[PDB]
Every structure is written in structure tokens, then in C-alpha cells.
Amino acid sequence: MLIVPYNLPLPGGVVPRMLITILGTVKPNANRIALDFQRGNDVAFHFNPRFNENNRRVIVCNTLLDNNWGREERQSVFPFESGKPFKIQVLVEPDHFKVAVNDAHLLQYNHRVKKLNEISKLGISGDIDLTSASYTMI
Ligand SMILES: CC(=O)N[C@H]1[C@H](O[C@H]2[C@@H](O)[C@@H](CO)O[C@@H](O[C@H]3[C@H](O)[C@@H](O)[C@H](O)O[C@@H]3CO)[C@@H]2O)O[C@H](CO)[C@@H](O)[C@@H]1O[C@@H]1O[C@H](CO)[C@H](O)[C@H](O)[C@H]1O
Numbered sequence: 001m002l003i004v005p006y007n008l009p010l011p012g013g014v015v016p017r018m019l020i021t022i023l024g025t026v027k028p029n030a031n032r033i034a035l036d037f038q039r040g041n042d043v044a045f046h047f048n049p050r051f052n053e054n055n056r057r058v059i060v061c062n063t064l065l066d067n068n069w070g071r072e073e074r075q076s077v078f079p080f081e082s083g084k085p086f087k088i089q090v091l092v093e094p095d096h097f098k099v100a101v102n103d104a105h106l107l108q109y110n111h112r113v114k115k116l117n118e119i120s121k122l123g124i125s126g127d128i129d130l131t132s133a134s135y136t137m138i
């Protein structure tokens, strides 16, 4: 088991064909999960499943630049379940991050941060038991 929050270095940043795989289990009564792809203090891609926002479940995605959050992108398709094992795959493509959960396509997030090779950390945080976090080039 990994300790959360967990930092995964992404050496030399991200690049198309880089596949990041996160395995874990959502805690019972979870409130949130966050994946934060970081460029220094900025968050190039924030992926934030929320389990109770006004008693609804929603994934919020955004970018943090100079400590300001941008315009949120919201997805109501919500494949996570409290208590249950999940797999998140983030595949870097030329124009977006492409996210699949449990082998099903979920969403894409267009690159707002252009310096992919400076997005050199992934923070994994929130209400999970984290089993593994890794990357490979496909
Ligand atoms: C309060 C909180 O949860 N802080 C988190 C931070 O959460 C923000 C993001 O999810 C953004 C993405 O757009 O939304 C913010 O809420 C919006 C909300 O969606 C809007 O409807 C509303 O109108 O505005 C608010 C705020 O603009 C969330 O507050 O996400 C970051 C990245 O994961 C977290 O780091 C932060 O938690 C803090 O992290 C610190 C270390 O990084 C410390 O752990 C600190 O104690 C945490 O509170």
C-alpha cells in the first residue's frame, strides 16, 4: 500500500504516448479524490471526483495558474463507487489528457498548460487506499 498523499515524479514532464496507471480502492463514505498533474506550483490538470456536492456525484477538472483556478470542466458520468476498487488510466495525447476508468473511456481534458515537459509531478490525494501508481510509454 502507498501513503496518501502520494507524489509520483514524472521525469522530464509528460509527452504524448505516456500512460499513467493508478490502482486503488475508494474508502467507504469517501468525499473526494484528486489527481494533480503539477508544473511547479501550478496544476496543469486537476482531476477531482466529488462524491457529495449538493448530494450529487460529479467529476471536476480544472487548471491552477499562479494560484488561480480557471473555468471548471464538469462530467456527470461518475464511474467510481465508495468502497470499491478502481483503475484510472491517464494517456497523454497531443491535444489532451485522455482518462479511462476501469477500462472505459471517461473524459478528455485539452492542454491549457503548453509546456508538457515541465509537468513533472503527479500528486494523488483524497479518500482512497492507494495500491499502485506508475507510468509506461506506449
Ligand atoms: C477546499 C479544497 O477542497 N481545496 C483543495 C482544492 O479544491 C479546489 C479545486 O477542486 C477547484 C477546481 O476548480 O474547485 C474548488 O472549489 C470551487 C468550486 O468547484 C466552485 O463551485 C466554487 O464556486 O469555487 C470553489 C473554489 O474556487 C476547490 O476548492 O484542490 C486542491 C488540488 O487538489 C487541493 O490542494 C486543495 O486542498 C488543499 O491542499 C493543500 C495542500 O495542497 C492542503 O492539503 C490544504 O489543507 C487543502 O485544503
Ligand SMILES: [Cl-]
Binding pocket: 112, 113, 114, 115
Ligand atoms: Cl505553459
